Amino acid sequence: GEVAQAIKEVAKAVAAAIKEVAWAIKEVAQAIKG
Amino acid sequence: GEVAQAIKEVAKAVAAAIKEVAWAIKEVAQAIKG
Amino acid sequence: GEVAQAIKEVAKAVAAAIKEVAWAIKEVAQAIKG
Amino acid sequence: GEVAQAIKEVAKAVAAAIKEVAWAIKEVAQAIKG
Amino acid sequence: GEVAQAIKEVAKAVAAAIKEVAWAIKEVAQAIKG
Amino acid sequence: GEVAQAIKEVAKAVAAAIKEVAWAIKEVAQAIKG
Amino acid sequence: GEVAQAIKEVAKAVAAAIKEVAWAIKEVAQAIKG
Ligand code: NA
Ligand code: NA
């Protein structure tokens, strides 16, 4: 159904974007270590 | 449907904004490295 | 409809607030760089 | 309606909290500048 | 209604947790200043 | 009801995860202080 | 039901992603400490 599919898109898109934030923060850690 | 379309808008808008956060954090990493 | 409109308000308000976070992080990068 | 009002409360409360995060990050930038 | 009440709980719990993030970031600002 | 229960699970899981972020940021503050 | 299951997926995916952010921030704390 369209509502369920839209909610699954929230899960997918928002989780993926938040994982991009996590990766950027790992890049901060790497810069500090360097 | 309007509810499904609104939920898709949450996915799109919130994910895009979170990506902006990731990019800004990458700028912090670059600032430290430099 | 009121439910769809409320969900659109979540998209708008939450995305805008997250963009403010991104901008503040840009300010951190600028501070580090001098 | 109660569901629409509850969703509006999500928009208001979560956006306001995220703005507090943005402001705290601005304070970090000003600390670094000092 | 149970759905409206659950949505209100999202607003309450998620906003409160995000405020804790803001407070922690203020601690980082204070640590830098010290 | 299953929808209300699922929404309550969003409140619980997401708030708890955000609290982990707050703690991690307190650890950054401690690292800077030390 | 499909809507309830989709909402549970939001809880799971978004919480997991936010935990990844917490772990990345811990890496920053460790980098500062080192
Ligand atoms: Na980068
Ligand atoms: Na990650």
Author numbering:
A (entry chain C), B (entry chain A), C (entry chain B), D (entry chain F), E (entry chain G), F (entry chain D), ...: 1 to 34
What did the original publication write about this model?
For example, CC-Tri and CC-Tet exchanged with each other, as did the higher-order CCs, CC-Pent2, CC-Hex2, and CC-Hept. These two classes—i.e., CC-Tri plus CC-Tet, and CC-Pent2, CC-Hex2 plus CC-Hept—are structurally distinct: the trimer and tetramer have consolidated hydrophobic cores, whilst the others have central channels and are α-helical barrels. Similarly, peptides with Type II interfaces where the g, a, d, and e residues all engage in helix–helix interactions—namely the pentameric, hexameric, and heptameric α-helical barrels, CC-Pent2, CC-Hex2 and CC-Hept—also exchange with each other. To address this, using the insight from the data and analysis presented here, we have tested two different strategies for increasing specificity of coiled coils: (i) alternate placement of salt bridge-promoting residues, lysine and glutamate to discriminate the tetramer from the trimer; and (ii) incorporation of hendecad repeats to separate the α-helical barrels.
Variations of this 3-4 spacing can lead to alternative CC sequences and structures. For CC-Pent2 and CC-Hept, initially, we replaced the third and second heptads, respectively, with hendecad repeats to give CC-Pent2-hen3 and CC-Hept-hen2, and using the Leu-at-h variants for both. This proved more soluble and retained orthogonality. However, overall, this revised set of peptides showed significant improvements in orthogonality across the whole set compared with the original basis set going into this study. The second strategy differentiates the α-helical barrels, CC-Pent2, CC-Hex2, and CC-Hept, by introducing hendecad repeats in a pentamer and heptamer to give CC-Pent2-hen3 and CC-Hept-IV-hen2. Fluorescence measurements show minimal exchange between a revised set of CC peptides: CC-Di, CC-Tri, CC-Tet*, CC-Pent2-hen3, CC-Hex2, and CC-Hept-IV-hen2. We have denoted this group of peptides as the Orthogonal Coiled-coil basis set.
